[PDB]
RNA sequence: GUUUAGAACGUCGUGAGACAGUUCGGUCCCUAUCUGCCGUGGGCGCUGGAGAACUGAGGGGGGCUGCUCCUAGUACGAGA
């Protein structure tokens with residue numbers, strides 16, 4: 001019953017953005033690259049793993065906050081396998097509670113942004129929710 | 142179906158009968174002369190006669206559209 005991964009190698013990251021900014025797409029790609037999934041499933045095809053719930057495969061949105069983990073070592077494997085507990089949160093204003101609950105406990109965040117339209121009405125809302133809890137965040141255009 | 146002759150009901154009439162009342166049953170002919178049209182030939186013409194290949198003035202035919210997929214979850218839209 002020893003420590004499998006050192007606690008310094010943990011990353012409690014999570015995704016928050018405006019609707020259709022590409023949160024679920026990034027997580028799907030992560031899982032695939034890290035080896036958790038064996039295929040890439042698109043969200044508008046209903047085949048993304050993070051949108052597990054029906055009315056999420058049908059409508060094409062994310063409603064709940066689903067938490068998974070993965071092991072990433074770097075491109076050229078520059079470090080030991082770090083464990084990332086990535087969390088995909090919905091970007092809609094109808095589910096702001098699903099961001100705040102997930103950003104209560106996240107150690108790090110990353111604010112993904114659409115390149116053609118950068119800062120959208122819900123981009124500012126998840127930014128204020130993140131700085132409420134003083135979360136250190138990155139940005140992925 | 143309606144629009145003959147048979148019969149019956151309801152109704153009307155003393156009655157024969159009658160009802161845009163309703164019921165059952167009840168003969169639909171024509172070998173195409175002309176025009177028209179569809180085809181298919183004969184004659185003559187086109188200026189010596191003939192065999193072929195053509196040009197195109199003109200005429201006719203034809204012209205319908207669904208559903209998916211890509212563009213693209215792109216434009217628009219806070220979102221949907």
Ligand SMILES: Nc1nc2c(ncn2[C@@H]2O[C@H](COP(=O)(O)OP(=O)(O)OP(=O)(O)O)[C@@H](O)[C@H]2O)c(=O)[nH]1
Nearest residue numbers: 019020021022023024025043044061062090091092
């Ligand atoms: N051209 C292009 N389309 C992308 C890209 N990333 C995502 N999309 C499309 O945008 C939609 C994905 O947006 P999502 O990330 O699934 O929605 P979300 O950001 O996870 O957040 P919620 O809607 O609240 O659940 C799909 O149609 C994607 O194919 C990209 O990098 N380039």
Ligand SMILES: [Mg+2]
Nearest residue numbers: 019020114117
């Ligand atoms: Mg858009």
Ligand SMILES: [Mg+2]
Nearest residue numbers: 020059060061
């Ligand atoms: Mg959508």
Ligand SMILES: [Mg+2]
Nearest residue numbers: 023024061062
């Ligand atoms: Mg999503």
Ligand SMILES: [Mg+2]
Nearest residue numbers: 174175176177
């Ligand atoms: Mg005549």
Ligand SMILES: [Mg+2]
Nearest residue numbers: 200201202203
């Ligand atoms: Mg013509």
Ligand SMILES: [Mg+2]
Nearest residue numbers: 044045213214
């Ligand atoms: Mg599409």
